[PDB]
Amino acid sequence: EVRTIKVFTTVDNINLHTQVVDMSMTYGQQFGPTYLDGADVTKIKPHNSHEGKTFYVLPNDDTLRVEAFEYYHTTDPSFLGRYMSALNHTKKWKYPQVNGLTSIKWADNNSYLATALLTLQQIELKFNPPALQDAYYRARAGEAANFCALILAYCNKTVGELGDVRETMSYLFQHANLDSCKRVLNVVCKTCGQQQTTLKGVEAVMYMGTLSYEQFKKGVQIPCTCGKQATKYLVQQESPFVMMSAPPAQYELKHGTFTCASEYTGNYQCGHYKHITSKETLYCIDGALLTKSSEYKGPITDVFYKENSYTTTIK
Amino acid sequence: RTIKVFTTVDNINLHTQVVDMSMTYGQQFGPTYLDGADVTKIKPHNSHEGKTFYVLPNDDTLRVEAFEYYHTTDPSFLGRYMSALNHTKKWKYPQVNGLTSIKWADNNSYLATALLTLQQIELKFNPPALQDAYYRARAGEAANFCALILAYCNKTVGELGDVRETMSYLFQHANLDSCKRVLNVVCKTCGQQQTTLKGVEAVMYMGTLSYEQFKKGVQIPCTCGKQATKYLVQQESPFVMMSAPPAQYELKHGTFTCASEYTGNYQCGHYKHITSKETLYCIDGALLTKSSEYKGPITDVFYKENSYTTTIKPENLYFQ
Ligand SMILES: [Zn+2]
Ligand SMILES: [Zn+2]
């Protein structure tokens, strides 16, 4: 009167849970949304050949919730669904090697993801969630569908939406081990005196307002709260890299003075990112396309620099 | 001879300048504006001494000032803001039913109902520019707020606007972080699937005007081919906005906060605003009409909210 097969369910592909399913009910009626080898089988009834196979499901009990938390480092019950929704699209993208880096061929307004992925491959960073570390290793090998889908899911963005590199890195850095990173700034006003500040973690590696790391060390003019103008400069830096960002204008990149950079062009509300990396010369990676030149000038928005330990000699 | 003036991108940080009356403002500052009017090709006058002029964010410091005030990095923003402001400063902003409206001009009806709506829902803007201008607009000086909405939406004065699109852009610049929405979709073949939305997506819905109908269930396609039922499980927000393609719809006193009526089509049309107070009021630019009931082609309805949790049991969804 009820026929069954044995299957395995999982939210992480590591902890497998035996389930006996009724062959007259769909997987969705028994599990909720269900996937077999990436394929959506929610509307399907079980087949004899499915016996023994592993199905991804969403976490709808305490056991699966704890396992999702330990793998993704999220308590949001919608995370896996939104990740699977992104993954439906990113699994169709192509991820060619371009000058030895995994890129992404243009699809679905994904240029900001391409330059973020290329950047992550050139700065020293360790991700805390096992799912993000695991997917990053796979991305490095040219299978970046899981990693891109996770990026979208951790930024709560959907495929096709406009992405911003600065916001994207900020979300990802929040899931990286940047706790030891340290930054000390000093701000001097001719009338108010000087004020020092110490930043840790993500705030210690990102700055908004200047693209030049060397200008940041020499001092930048910023509005002072007294209404006058003041000079802010970097006193100390402890981090494996720094990310310098600014509202775009026209900026010149020169070989050997930076690690990599992002350029933003086209319609501002739905624009296009290109990646520039410094190797033996400058390479402009534009999705699957490659060009090379001695220098590069354009609307740069983010520049990444290598760092270890810096202390100023100023004052 | 020469005179001292102030340049600015945000009207907070003022940069002292000396200009000469023999050259244009443009030769000295680049593109330059005085209360929205383009004075790039104008020579300074005696009577300009001490006035504050907007300039484009043409070095790193000014680009930081513009970013901190407007929360955009678009280099075209300031020019577009000024171009709109040169017009919106000439609009009239009468008080209608205790609310700041806009007298009709330049196809601005969508901005009027957006402005009237913002004065009736709880919303905090993140950009200082929008915060400051909203407060001024609440008090009746809405020219800068209206010009900023145009700039943020990449719309020019005179262009046909869309209220739903306009609110999307404004909500994008509002603190909606803690807003949350949980939905359930039930298919007889596929079972249940729950979805959670945050931010702008948690307060906006396209497909039905009726908040009550959203709670009770709406029919949608399922990828298996049958129709499924989508309904609201949980809502945490100070308001919700329900939108639909325009259709004849009856608004009843006490059942909604305010709504937008649209007459026209995809190329050209006109919006009016309907608010529920002691009775229903249709604010049509400067014009006020009071009615016990209202019937019209409604496209957006706003409702007050705080915390909602469904009492539907999935197993009973179709007992209706
Ligand atoms: Zn000061
Ligand atoms: Zn179905």
Curated annotation (Swiss-Prot), chain B:
In which residues is Zn(2+) 4 bound?
187, 190, 222, 224
Give every Ubiquitin-like domain span: 1-55
Q: How does it sit in the membrane?
A: Multi-pass membrane protein
Give residue ranges for domain Peptidase C16: 69-314
Task: Quote the annotated effect of residue 254 to S.
Answer: In strain: Omicron/EG.5.1
Q: Changing residue 90 to N: what effect?
A: In strain: Beta/B.1.351
Subcellular location as annotated:
Host endoplasmic reticulum membrane
Q: What is the effect of changing residue 2 to I?
A: In strain: Kappa/B.1.617.1
Q: What is the effect of changing residue 143 to D?
A: In strain: Alpha/B.1.1.7
Q: Which residues form the active site?
A: 109 (for pl-pro activity), 270 (for pl-pro activity), 284 (for pl-pro activity)
Q: What is the effect of changing residue 73 to L?
A: Increased cleavage of ubiquitin in vitro; no effect on ISG15 cleavage in vitro
Q: How, per the record, is this protein's activity regulated?
A: Inhibited in vitro by GRL-0617.
Instruction: List the catalysed reactions.
Output: Thiol-dependent hydrolysis of ester, thioester, amide, peptide and isopeptide bonds formed by the C-terminal Gly of ubiquitin (a 76-residue protein attached to proteins as an intracellular targeting signal)
* Zinc finger boundaries on the chain: C4-type: 187-224
Question: Where is the signal peptide, in residue numbers?
Answer: none
Q: Subunit structure, briefly?
A: May form homohexamers. Interacts with N protein.
What is known about what this protein does?
Responsible for the cleavages located at the N-terminus of the replicase polyprotein. Participates together with nsp4 in the assembly of virally-induced cytoplasmic double-membrane vesicles necessary for viral replication. Antagonizes innate immune induction of type I interferon by blocking the phosphorylation, dimerization and subsequent nuclear translocation of host IRF3. Also prevents host NF-kappa-B signaling. In addition, PL-PRO possesses a deubiquitinating/deISGylating activity and processes both 'Lys-48'- and 'Lys-63'-linked polyubiquitin chains from cellular substrates.
- The protein in question is named Papain-like protease nsp3
Q: Which organism is it from?
A: Severe acute respiratory syndrome coronavirus 2
The record lists the lineage as:
Viruses, Riboviria, Orthornavirae, Pisuviricota, Pisoniviricetes
